Amino acid sequence: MSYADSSRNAVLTNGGRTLRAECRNADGNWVTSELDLDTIIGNNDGHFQWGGQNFTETAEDIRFHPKEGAAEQPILRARLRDCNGEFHDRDVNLNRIQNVNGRLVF
């Protein structure tokens, strides 16, 4: 139930914070939806954590590929600072985010 299965034109915007896509609704029309990832993803000791917040505050080199790799997955990458102050390049698959009738929802 990844949003990506029923959405298109997904991009990361707003300083690395916001996922934007066009999301198909029950009628088969396409609705523009944004979701601020900083409301739902944190940085826990240098790792992405769903249900956390404000990952961007302790991140560098934030970027997104909507259809990455052989699996064509929506992969968000960043260098995250751990609690010892060291950066590690990390990745998280955004397929936890759903498309609920035209809206991106965690």
For 17, 20, 59, 79, 86, the CA distances from 23, given in Å and listed in that order, are: 18, 9, 28, 29, 37
Domain harbouring 98, CATH code:
2.30.60.10
The region that residue 16 occupies, defined by phi over 0 for left and psi between -120 and 50 for alpha, beta otherwise, is left
Long-range contacts of 50-53 (CB under 8 A, 24+ apart): 50/92, 50/96, 50/106
Experimental approach taken: X-ray
Domain count, the chain: 1
Q: Resolution in A for the shown PDB structure?
A: 1.6
**Structural domain for 95, as ranges:** 1-106
CB atoms within 10 A of CB 41: 26
The sign one gets for the Cα dihedral 34, 13, 67, 97 is negative
